[PDB]
Design an enzyme around this catalytic site. Structure first.
Site, PDB file in Angstrom:
ATOM      1  N   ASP A 163       0.839  -1.202   0.000  1.00  0.00           N
ATOM      2  CA  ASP A 163       0.000   0.000   0.000  1.00  0.00           C
ATOM      3  C   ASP A 163       0.875   1.254   0.000  1.00  0.00           C
ATOM      4  O   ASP A 163       1.353   1.686   1.056  1.00  0.00           O
ATOM      5  CB  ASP A 163      -0.910  -0.006   1.219  1.00  0.00           C
ATOM      6  N   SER A 178      -0.628  15.505 -12.112  1.00  0.00           N
ATOM      7  CA  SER A 178      -0.865  15.140 -13.496  1.00  0.00           C
ATOM      8  C   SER A 178      -1.104  16.403 -14.317  1.00  0.00           C
ATOM      9  O   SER A 178      -1.651  17.393 -13.824  1.00  0.00           O
ATOM     10  CB  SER A 178      -2.080  14.219 -13.571  1.00  0.00           C
TER      11      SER A 178
END
Length: 330
Positions: A35, A199
């Site tokens: 994770d 992004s």
């Protein structure tokens, strides 16, 4: 040193991935959920409340000659999905894919929430976010990667998750045969303890690319892709009959639909998520309403590039003094 381990989807939908991890002496192998959005290595154990164990493999520290109770240490964690667990702490030897750390903090669960009990395939979590998020008190502990970093050939790990197939976690090296083209690296902020990056935009299907900054985290422990409501609405508008359902808890779409791809930007590069990766199947057995793999982050407080996005790429988690992330197509 290096390590390399195969990671395997837990079910036919890729809801999560499990990777075998050797703990203790002799080794006890547990299948952990790696994770990158958390920083605790915790396991089902001989200390877990018996009614909360339902088929998981447990760590028994009393059977490990290298286990040592970390005196006075406790831990307690709550995850973004509302699940939680807590317990005490041992140090022990932990190996992943041939890479060994001695003295790793292994957080033994005394209690786990129902969602963990109900998933017999996941024996615990191995956190790969920054150690500043580790919950052990009163002395915070280091992640497996942080403990291994100095020994690794290069201070990196890579995630290469499969679509409906196994993939690979590598530690200490970048397998140049595992991706196509080049790896595009992008800046990371560690201020929230995550692999947080920006992004450069998105496209839906064959549509034009929209240049827009989308801050979010690279999170292997989250199944889906969670993005701003504007972006998510633009995606599902291209699927006839798709709608947001308050009762189901997100966007659903007719199972008869063919889904468009979704592209996200990494600098000037582009990662394409095929439409099939966005199908999470019937909302309930036999339903013709299917659950979408791109959902709104509006109720989270952060955008999350979970498995739906990461499995479309070869992802480099570069833990150099100034960390960065790398993405390549594959």
């Amino acid at each position: 040193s290096t390590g390399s381990a195969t990671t395997t989807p837990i079910d036919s939908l890729d809801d999560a991935y499990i990777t075998p991890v050797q703990i203790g002496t002799p080794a006890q192998t547990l299948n952990l959920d790696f994770d990158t959005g958390s920083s605790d290595l915790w396991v089902f154990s001989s200390e877990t409340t018996a009614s909360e164990v339902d088929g998981q493999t447990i760590y028994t520290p009393s059977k490990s000659t290298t286990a040592k109770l970390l005196s006075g240490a406790t831990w307690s964690i709550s995850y973004g999905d509302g699940s939680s667990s807590s317990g005490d702490v041992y140090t022990d030897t932990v190996s992943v894919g041939g890479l060994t750390v001695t003295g790793q903090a292994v957080e033994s669960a005394k209690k786990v929430s129902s969602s963990f009990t109900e998933d017999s395939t996941i024996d615990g979590l191995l956190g790969l976010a920054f150690s500043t998020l580790n919950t052990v008190s009163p002395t915070q502990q280091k992640t497996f990667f942080d403990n291994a970093k100095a020994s690794l050939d290069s201070p990196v790990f890579t995630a290469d998750l499969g679509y409906h197939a196994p993939g690979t976690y590598n530690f200490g090296f970048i397998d140049t045969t595992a991706y196509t083209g080049s790896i595009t690296y992008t800046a990371v902020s560690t201020k929230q303890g995550f692999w947080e990056w920006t992004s450069t935009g998105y496209a839906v299907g064959s549509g034009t690319f929209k240049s827009t900054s989308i801050d979010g985290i690279a999170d292997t422990g989250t199944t889906l892709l969670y993005l701003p409501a504007t972006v998510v609405s633009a995606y599902w508008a291209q699927v006839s009959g798709a709608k947001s359902s308050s009762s189901v808890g997100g966007y659903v779409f007719p199972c008869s639909a063919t889904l468009p791809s979704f592209t996200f930007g990494v600098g000037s590069a582009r990662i394409v998520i095929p439409g099939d990766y966005i199908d999470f199947g019937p909302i309930s057995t036999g339903s013709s309403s299917c659950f979408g793999g791109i959902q709104s982050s509006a109720g989270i407080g952060i955008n999350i590039f979970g498995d739906v996005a990461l499995k479309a790429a070869f992802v480099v988690f570069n833990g150099a003094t100034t960390p960065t992330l790398g993405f390549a197509s594959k």
